[PDB]
Every structure is written in C-alpha cells, then in structure tokens.
Amino acid sequence: SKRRVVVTGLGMLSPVGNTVESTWKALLAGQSGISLIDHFDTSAYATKFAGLVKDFNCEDIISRKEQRKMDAFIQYGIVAGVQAMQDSGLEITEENATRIGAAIGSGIGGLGLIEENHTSLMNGGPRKISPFFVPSTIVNMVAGHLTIMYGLRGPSISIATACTSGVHNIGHAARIIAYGDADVMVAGGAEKASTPLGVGGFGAARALSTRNDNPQAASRPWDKERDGFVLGDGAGMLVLEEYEHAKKRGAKIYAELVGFGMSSDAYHMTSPPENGAGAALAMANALRDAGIEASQIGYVNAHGTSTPAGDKAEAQAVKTIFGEAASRVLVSSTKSMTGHLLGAAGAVESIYSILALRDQAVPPTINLDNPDEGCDLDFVPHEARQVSGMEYTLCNSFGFGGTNGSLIFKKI
Amino acid sequence: SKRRVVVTGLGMLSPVGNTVESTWKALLAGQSGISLIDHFDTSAYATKFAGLVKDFNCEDIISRKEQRKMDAFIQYGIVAGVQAMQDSGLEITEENATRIGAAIGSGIGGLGLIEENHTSLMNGGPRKISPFFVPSTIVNMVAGHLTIMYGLRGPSISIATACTSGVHNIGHAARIIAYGDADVMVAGGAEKASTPLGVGGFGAARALSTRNDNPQAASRPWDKERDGFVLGDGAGMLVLEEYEHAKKRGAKIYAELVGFGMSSDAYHMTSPPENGAGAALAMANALRDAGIEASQIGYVNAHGTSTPAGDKAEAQAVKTIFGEAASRVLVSSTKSMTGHLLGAAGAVESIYSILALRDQAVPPTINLDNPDEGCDLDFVPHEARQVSGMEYTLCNSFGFGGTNGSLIFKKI
Amino acid sequence: STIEERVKKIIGEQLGVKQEEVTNNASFVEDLGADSLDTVELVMALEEEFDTEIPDEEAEKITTVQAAIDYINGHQA
Amino acid sequence: STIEERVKKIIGEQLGVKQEEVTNNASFVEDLGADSLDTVELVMALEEEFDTEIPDEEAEKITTVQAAIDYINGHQA
C-alpha cells in the first residue's frame, strides 16, 4: 500500500515568462530570455549578460514593507509558490494544516542583500547591518514565508545542493509524502545570482560564457562553439500531493512523479568527468525507483549547461543508460533559452518535463548549429518537436564534479 | 521488512574539545567553551564573545594548499567527518561505493570567505575574486569534499534549515537508508559564524547576549537573567548504517535511530511562540515514527538557546508532550556550555544524546541559578546527573518561528 | 521639508502606511503593526536620514510617532 | 629577495611544494599537480605580489616556472 505522489499545481518565474504558460509557450517558440545586464556596472566584468526576470511585479502579493526584508530570490520563490498554490486550488484548513509542508531550496541564496549588508558593514560598522540581514538572505526563507502565509505546519526542509537543488527538493518532497509524513508538499527552487558577486564569482572560476557580442547565442549546449554557461534567474514551484488525497478533493492532476535517483561523482570538478558514471548512476537509480526500462523514456530534459566538458560527459551518460534506444530518445537542454537557473534549474525543468507530458511536445535546444563529432543523439535542435505516445519524461540535474539527481514523471 | 538504521561512527569539533570523548568529558564537568573573540576587532560590536574551536590543527588531514580553498566551516566538517569514518572502521570498496553517501549541511555557510571575497571585490573589482570563491563557501561542500576523499558515489544531499540543519540532515540520512537508496550515510552539520558578518548579523537582530563582562555565564537557558543566545563553532558527524550491514561486517554500534519528526511553526519569528505547538508537533511525529510513548523518554537534549521567548515556548511544548511524566523526564541544554552551533547544533547534540545512552549520564544546564516561576521541570542544573534504565533519548532542534526537528535514539 | 514631516515620511514608508495614518499619538507596534525588528530598522532609518547616532538604551524609548519627533528635534548632532 | 626566487616562492606556496621541487623546467599541471583553477589563482597570486595586471590571453601562456619567471622579469608595470 505504498502511497503514490502526483503533481497538482505549478508556478514559475523565468527569463522567458512570468507564468507557467507564457514561459512554456516562449520555449516552444525557441525564444531566448538572455539579455545585457544593466542593474550594475559590468565594465570590469568578463560576462555582461544573463537570463533576467523582466517586468517583475509582486506588489499585489508582497507589500513594499516586506519586500525590503527579502532578497530578490526569496521574492521570486514566494510569487512562484503562490502561483502553484492558487493553481492547485488547495483549501488549507485547521485540520489538514499539519499534513502540508514545503521542500524549497537554492544553490546560492540572498547574494544581493549579503553584498549590501557587507557594504554597509565595511562603511559604517556593525551598527549599519540590517536586523533583517539573516532572515533576508538564508536559503530556507522561501519555505519560511510560504509556510507562514498559507498556515503550513507540516514538514519543511530546504536542500541546497548547488545546481541539483531543484531536483533534490522535489524528489525528497515526494519521499516525505511517500513515507507518510505529509499529504501535500510545495517543492522547488529559486535563484537570483545575477549580482556582482555572482557574475564575478563564476567568472572568477572561468566557467561563464564570454559571448557579450551576442548574448542570445552564447548558451549553445553540445555545440563546438560553446565557452561556458549563462546565468539565469527565476523560480519553479510544484504542489506535490498524495494520489488518493488529490482525487478525493477533485484535484487538477498534471502528471505522476514515479522515480527519484541520486548519486555522487566522487571527483572534484577540475578532474575530467569523462564517462559521466555519476550522471548515469543517478538516472539508473531513478529508473529502478520507478521500475521501468530506459526505452520507455520519450524525453530527457538534460542538464546541458553549454559547458565544453559537462555536455560531453552528459552525452556519454545518456549513451550508457539508453544504449540501443539512445539515438531514438529525445534529449533537450532548455538552458539554451533560459540559461542556468542553478538551484532553481531542476525546479523549472521538472515543470517543462511535466508539460511535455501534457502537450505532447518537446522544447528545442537552440543555437545548436554543429554538434560534436562524438555524438549521434537527437538533441531536438532549433525547433520544437511534436510527439505522440510519450508516457515518461526524465529530468536531470548534474554536477560533473558533485551531486546528481534525476526525476521521472509519468502521464496521468 | 523495513530496514533499521543504526549509528556506527562519531566525529566532532566543539568549543570544549576537539574529539568526541574530550568534548563529552568536558560537558559532564560543566566546563564552558565560551571566550572572548580576538581574531577580529570587536570594539564596535555589542557581543564580543562566542564558542570558539581552540587549537584547531588539520594539517595532517587537509594540506595548506587545500585549506585556502575552504572556509573554516568546511575545514571543521571534513575533520569531524574523517573522525566519524575512522571511528566506524568502514572499508570503502569498488563494490559498496555506490551504497555510501552523505547528508551534511550548514545554516550560514562560508561567511568568512564571502566577506573576504566581497572585500576583494569592493577594493579591486571582479578580477580580485578568487576562482575558488563559490566552492569555498556554499554549504554543500562539506559533503562534496568528504564524498571525494573517501570515494563515495551514493546519495548526497545538504539540508540548510538554519538551526534545524543538524537534526534534518541526520534524520533524512536515515530516511534515505530506510528507503533503500543507501546502506551507509555520513550525516551532520558544521558552522563557523563567529565572523564580523555573523556576530554583526545576529547582533543586528538583537538576538545575541550582551554579557561581555562574563562570557561563560552569558548562556543561561531558562534562567531569569538570560538576554539572548551565544554563538558557537564546530561540527558534528555521524556514520549512519543499516543494521544488517553493520552487524555483518562486525561494526561498532552506539545506538539505534528509531524516530524522526518534522513540523513548521507557521508564524514569523517576532510573533509570540507561546505554546510551542510546532515544537510539540515535531516531538509528537517522532514518537509516532518510533512507536513509543513519551514516558519512555529518559533524557531530552533541549534546544534551549538561552532566549527569553524561545526557552519559555520549548518548556510549554515539553509539558504538552510529556504531561504527567514531565516533572520526571530529564531535560538539558548543552548550549549552556558550548553555545549555539546553529546548523551544527542538532548534529553535536545528537551525539550527546547517543553518548547519554552509552554512559548512562546526562550533561547539565550550567548557569541556571534561578529558573522561571512558570516551570517545575528538571533541567539537570549545575551538575551532571547519573542515571539508570535510560533507554530512549530525544534530540530537539527548534525554530520558534520556523522549522522543527526531533530525533529519538534507542539503546543497543 | 520640515523635520516633523520628514520623520513622518520615514515612519510611514518603513511601516508601509499612508501618511494620514501616521498621526502623532500613533504607536509603532499597536497602531501601525510593527514588530520588534520593524522598530529596530525604523530607528536605523531615522539615523540614516539625519546622520545621528541614537543609543540603544534611548532608542527603546522611541515607541510612538510623537516620541520620535521629539528626539530628533532636540538633538541634530 | 630576487625576482626569480620570489616567483618560485609564490609558486611553491600556491601549489604546496617544497621549493626544491619548483625547478625552472617544471610544469604547473604536469610536474606540480595543479588543476585549472590552481593555475588561475597562481597567476592572481603573481599579480598580487608584484602589482601588475596580466591579461587573460597572456596568462594562459604561463604554464611552467620558467614561463612565469620570464614574464614578470620583462615587465614591472
């Protein structure tokens, strides 16, 4: 009598749209949300562009008084979390409140208000630090505010595993529901790292693309001309619900979450990933957790950060898991349009994987003009691909030098 | 055939000792690890003291080359993690590597190197940011380095839920083992927030004790003279193992982890906690997860941050759960000697709860000269208490305005 | 550009209330919905706007709008 | 206090090797066990010690100890 976990609510902010549907429609059109940064001076920065949330307006959800106590990434998470709750139509009562929690994380956190508070410190001493510094920056405050404004008393965790946070938070929200500690969980991630310390940080590690002259073509996964990943802001939120609890209250049902896999690479990051044995181990554990064969997977929302080493390692992991049906399964990196949302990347890409089950369509990998000579795989390049019979999707968040996570979704 | 999780390895750094045994012996003697800060100028700071790790020497474990790529809190976690692995005697092979992972978190992270890198930024621009900035600061790098140096390929997560991180990481390491995704997990937390931004941060929120004139008496949980909590550094690590896997390889066994409970408060933090209904809900869920009555609990390692509001709310939650056997169960706050280790507090206090099962002794709550008029509970004040028949211990990490976690350990 | 109206502007903006609600006898925590950390950042906002250091033992005595106006007026240091 | 020995000191300390191992023909990644980010912080350490901006396209050409010594010598700007 092991309980099944199902998805009943969606919410999202992304560089190509401020709702789930506008974002999804923008991706199917191959539209890029990457643009030049203008909220700080990028003169001395090697990367001057990122995937920004445009025309963000949370004034009707978060008052200006509370916005000052929130870093941008928390504001993104609350708005996306409110959208998911409103979409689920869930009615929180005094009786079911202790059965509803959250699992929302971030890879970086409140980098913008950390910079501001430390600037206040270096100029005026500790008396200039805001009393809201800590609650406005730590990664668990998205779950914090959401459990408060909806009256959630259930289990709430916050997984910060860098760019695996989104997949890890959703996967363990499902584990918490399967274990019986909760019937409903709001799970996802949120990121706003397009700051001087964020762009400078990854730029210091030489991991960022430098194609300032053409920001929309900089993110080119599996293309011979890639030169690093592109930062992206946003948030993704899902309302995860037990299957009987959902059908009983008459709930909208997007797809069933049937598999969750985890693994560690056990090499640093500068070491050559080569075979992607960690990535393949994560996908393998998720297939066994669901009890299906890799040949039943129709679409794979890849990690695909447009990194020279990372993309080649993920391609070898896909070849290892799929093998014979590798050249037939559809793989795609939505980061070609949105950029890398880091701790939220797994969250937004889980929704893309669910929507591919609903609309029977696959978003493309734009800017893939000429792939590696080492690959045959169908990366669904340039334009989206209509599909039929698609029943299982696979969402991957990899580290190529760290933690790995994989989620499998099933239709109906 | 639900698998049982058991503890087979311990490691710790604390303000009263650099090993598990020296720390445990120091606590049983009521020794305080709180002292004046001298690694930065505390002239303009309202709090000038904290619980510091003294005479820290990791040169034989971490080379000076790798220490520069690590914030202090990561160095603490690796050393404590190495101690736990060496204590478990676990032999990592090519065959069992994919069944061994980690669950290690932190509430704040690499605050020291964030300050340094941002100082480099504000003085010399983004070219002065270290390429190791991101990998030297984010909270998941303790699990990162440990999985690398031991060759761990299993599931690795990192829960950052502020001062509930330690309990949450250990609890979900056990959930991962119970689910069957891993046979061994190294779980815990690590913190080094005694920095200008950390002391200034909590000092800005007016949450820190101001008793500079007597730092060793500042942390006084449930005492009428308390004025806020005291920061503490350190790390706690446990080797969590499946019970058959442990007995088969002939493993040292400290205690069995039988219960894990979670809850959310659903009020901000400035709101009055009052009844501690969230704290009591966390303890209740852990009792049901273990299947025991509260009257079977012999010792409760309380949160007890020496906060005027937090201590009173936790006392009401203990009265609600225990009720009749409340005035009989032993409760204690080890933070009276070590201070608040934040993300690591739940980790070190889980080891104290396990060692109380082994030595049949309970560490005291020092500086408890005159408690509230509202309480009768035995807080084991001034001196440790010898005990017999103790079979279950309870480790609490609360938020009083956030997430809550509770772990129950059973002897043998 | 008066000091009385500048103080009322910082208060209303800090606590998110229209300036008509910021009367003189209005209390921060009772009439304007401020929690403890709200009052702490409000005093800091007052310090930032007028370039004055307000001691912590004296800031705790600033609980109403009139109590605020009377302090900053008789100082300017 | 020579420039040749100051460069060798930064290299040996950055890569954690005794200065006897820091010979002239020694390569950072092959003879001294440096990864990519090791070389990047090594060039920054060189810049920090001698107050010189080294361009990124020219820093990538500094892969051995002799290659390092020859750059900082013929500059000092």
Do the annotations mark residue A307 as ligand-binding? yes
CB contact under 8 Å between A270 and D36, yes or no, is yes
Of B46, B204, B270, the CB nearest to C36: B270
Decide: residue A189, CB within 10 A, 0-12 exposed, 13-18 middle, 19+ buried: buried
Residues A238 and A346: their CA atoms lie apart, in Å, by 11
Give the residue from B2, B229, B264, B269 with the most A CB atoms within 10 Å of its CB, the best one to mutate.
B264
* Binding positions of B for platensimycin: 270, 303, 307-309, 340
Resolution of the structure in the document, Å: 2.3
Q: Do B264 and A135 touch (CB under 8 A)?
A: no
Nearest CA in chain A to B195: A126
Give contacts of D22 with chain B, Cβ < 8 Å: none
C37 with B270: Cβ contact below 8 A: yes
Among chain C residues, CA nearest to B207: C37
Of B147, B162, B175, the CB nearest to A264: B147
Query: 3-class SS at B152?
Result: coil
Residue A147 assigned ligand-binding role: no
B7 CA: distance to closest CA in chain D (Å): 37
User: Which 3 state secondary structure label does DSSP give A322?
Assistant: helix
A309 is in an annotated binding site: yes
Residue B257: its H or E element = strand B255-264
d(CA B255, CA A239): 37
Alpha carbon distance B364, B366 (integer Å): 6
Which residue, among B37, B104, B161, would best test binding to A if mutated, counting the most A CBs under 10 Å from its CB? B161
Is residue A350 situated within a structural domain?
yes
Same domain assignment for residues A128 and A18: yes
Same domain, A218 and A295: no
Asked if C37 lies within 8 A of B271 by C-beta distance, the reply is: no
Interface of C with A in 36-65 (CB under 8 A): 37, 40-41, 44, 53
Distance (Å) of CA B307 to CA B97, B336, B368, C70: 44, 11, 13, 33
Q: Name the experimental technique.
A: X-ray
Which of D15, D37, D53 lies closest to B131 in CB terms? D37
- Whether residue B214 sits in one domain with residue B313: no
Is beta strand A234-242 parallel, antiparallel or unpaired with respect to A184-191? Answer: antiparallel
Residue partners of D6: CB distance under 8 A and separation at least 6? D49, D50
Q: What three-state secondary structure class fits A283?
A: helix
Domain end: B229, B259, B289, which one?
B259
What interhelical angle do A196-204 and B111-124 show, nearest 10?
A: 90
Instruction: Please state, as a whole number, how many other Cβ atoms lie within 10 Å of the Cβ of residue B23.
Output: 27
Q: Which residue has the tokens 């918490």?
A: A176
Helix (H) or strand (E) holding A41: none
Verify whether the Cβ–Cβ distance B130 to D15 is below 8 Å: no
Q: Where among B198, B231, B259 does a domain terminate? A: B259
Touching check for B44 and chain C: CB below 8 Å?
Answer: no
- C2, with CB counted inside 10 A (0-12, 13-18, 19+), is exposed
The CA angle D55-D56-D61, to the nearest 5 degrees, is 100
| Cβ contact A130–C16 (<8 Å) | no
Residue numbers in A near B199 (CB within 8 A): 126
Which residue range is the domain that position B82 belongs to?
Answer: 6-259
Same domain, yes or no: B159 and B255: yes
Strands (E), A270-375: 297-301, 330-332, 361-362
Question: For position A288, which CATH number holds?
Answer: 3.40.47.10
SS3 A236: strand
Computed from CA positions of residues A175, A180, A185, A190, in that sequence, does the dihedral angle turn out positive or negative?
Answer: negative
Does C37 sit within 8 Å of A131, measured CB to CB? yes
Among A259, A278, A301, the domain-final residue is A259
User: What subunits make at least 3 CB pairs under 8 angstroms with A?
Assistant: B, C, D
Provide CB contacts within 8 A for B398, sequence distance 6+. B163, B164, B276, B278, B279, B282, B303, B310, B313, B314, B317, B404, B405
Q: Are residues B154 and B172 in the same domain?
A: yes
| Binding partners of C (≥3 Cβ pairs within 8 A) | A, B
- Mutation pick from A270, A271, A307, A400 vs chain D, by most beta carbons of D within 10 Å, is A270
Alpha-carbon span A87 to A24, nearest angstrom: 16
Residue A59, both tokens: 């004034």
List the beta bridge partners of residue A299.
A330, A393
Structure tokens at A171: 């996967």
Residues from chain B contacting residue C35 (CB–CB below 8 Å):
268, 270-271
Touching status, chains D and C (3+ beta-carbon pairs under 8 Å): no
Distance between CA B208 and CA B231 in Å, rounded? Answer: 8
Q: Is residue B1 part of a domain?
A: no
Annotation marks residue B163 as catalytic: yes
Question: Tokens 């397009």 sit at which residue?
Answer: A194
Does B91 share its domain with B176? yes
DSSP string, B188-252: EEEE---SHHHHHHHHHTT-B---TT-GGGT--TTBTT--SB-BB-EEEEEEEEEHHHHHHTT--
Evaluate whether residue B128 is within a structural domain: yes
On whether both A221 and A307 belong to a single domain, the answer is no
Residues 6+ apart with CB under 8 A from A114: A71, A137, A197, B114, B118, B197
- In this structure, the answer to whether residues B252 and B300 fall within a common structural domain is no
Task: Give the gap in angstroms from C-alpha C53 to the nearest C-alpha of chain A.
Answer: 10
Residues A89 and A66 occupy one common structural domain:
yes
Chain B partners within 8 Å of A179 (Cβ):
175, 179
**Residue D42 has which token pair?**
């090594």
d(CA B360, CA B384): 11
D71 to chain B, minimum CA–CA distance in Å?
19
Distance from CA of C58 to the nearest CA of A (A): 15
Neighbours of D, requiring at least 3 CB pairs below 8 Å, are A, B
Contact yes or no for A131 and C40 at CB 8 A: yes
CA D15 to chain B, closest CA, distance in angstroms equals 6
Nearest Cα neighbor of B242 from B403, B3, B35 is: B3
Considering the domain architecture, whether residues B323 and B193 belong to the same structural domain is answered as no
Shortest CB distance from A131 goes to which of C16, C41, C53?
C41
- Any domain includes B131: yes
Distances (CA, A) of A273 to A231, A278, A342, C59: 22, 9, 19, 58
- What CA–CA distance (Å, rounded) separates A36 from B215? 51
- The DSSP bridge partners found for residue B159 are A159
- Which of B161, C31, D56, D37 has its CA nearest to residue A47? D56
Q: What are phi and psi of B181, to 5 degrees?
A: -80, -10
> Residue A68: which residues within 8 A CB-CB, separation 6 or more?
A132
CB contact (8 A) between residue B131 and residue D14: no
Q: How many domains does chain B have?
A: 2
Calpha distance D41→D26 (Å, rounded): 18
Our CA dihedral for B16, B19, B20, B21, rounded to 10 degrees, sits at -80
Residues of C in contact with B205 (CB under 8 A): 37, 40
CB B190 within 8 A of CB B235: yes
